[PDB]
Amino acid sequence: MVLSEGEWQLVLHVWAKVEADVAGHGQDILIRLFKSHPETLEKFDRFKHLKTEAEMKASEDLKKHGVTVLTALGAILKKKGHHEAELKPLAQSHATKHKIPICYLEFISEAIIHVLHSRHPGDFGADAQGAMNKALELFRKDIAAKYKELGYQG
Numbered sequence: 001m002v003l004s005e006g007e008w009q010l011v012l013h014v015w016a017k018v019e020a021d022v023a024g025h026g027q028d029i030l031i032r033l034f035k036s037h038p039e040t041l042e043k044f045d046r047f048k049h050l051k052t053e054a055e056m057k058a059s060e061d062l063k064k065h066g067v068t069v070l071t072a073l074g075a076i077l078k079k080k081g082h083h084e085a086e087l088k089p090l091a092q093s094h095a096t097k098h099k100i101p102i103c104y105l106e107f108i109s110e111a112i113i114h115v116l117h118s119r120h121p122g123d124f125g126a127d128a129q130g131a132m133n134k135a136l137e138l139f140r141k142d143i144a145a146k147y148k149e150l151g152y153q154g
């Protein structure tokens with residue numbers, strides 16, 4: 001699958017808004033993930049003690065991680081599909097160390113879409129949401145292929 005340049009521009013135009021405050025967006029996204037699919041929190045030995053949204057919001061460490069996650073994803077999106085170099089270490093760690101199934105990457109993709117839809121109606125209309133879905137699908141497709149190369153079913 002291949003996104004058009006027009007599609008990449010819709011992706012990067014909403015990402016430009018995320019970048020006004022990546023820390024805020026990362027908190028929203030991880031909290032949405034953990035609330036919508038509580039099982040995902042159990043993968044984080046670092047964070048699985050957090051009991052409530054209030055505790056999550058107050059966690060400086062969770063905020064730090066959200067910035068790390070969105071910055072890595074931002075770097076991937078800015079490659080506009082040319083993300084082989086970026087996907088190698090991410091696939092290896094997430095397959096082998098963290099053991100994150102592809103379904104959980106689907107869950108975080110859903111969280112990203114939900115947060116952008118909520119925060120950014122001006123840059124996340126139907127066409128833009130479709131482009132972001134396509135970008136995130138491409139990301140998961142390529143990650144899943146790497147998972148298989150690495151010996152993880154996903």
Ligand code: HEM
Nearest residue numbers: 040043044046068069072073089090093098100104105108
């Ligand atoms: C958009 C998809 C994701 C991106 C871009 C991303 C990015 C990252 C990055 C950059 C790191 C630090 C370096 C590394 O270990 O590779 C990391 C760590 C980690 N990721 Fe992800 N991640 C994603 C999805 C997920 C999901 C869905 C889960 C769990 C359901 C997860 C679980 C973890 C865990 C447990 C760590 C180690 C946290 C720690 O103890 O420091 N990741 N991730």
Ligand SMILES: *[C@@H]1CC(=O)N(C)C1=O
Nearest residue numbers: 039101102103104154
């Ligand atoms: C998706 C949901 C889950 O718990 N696993 C392990 C999946 O593959």
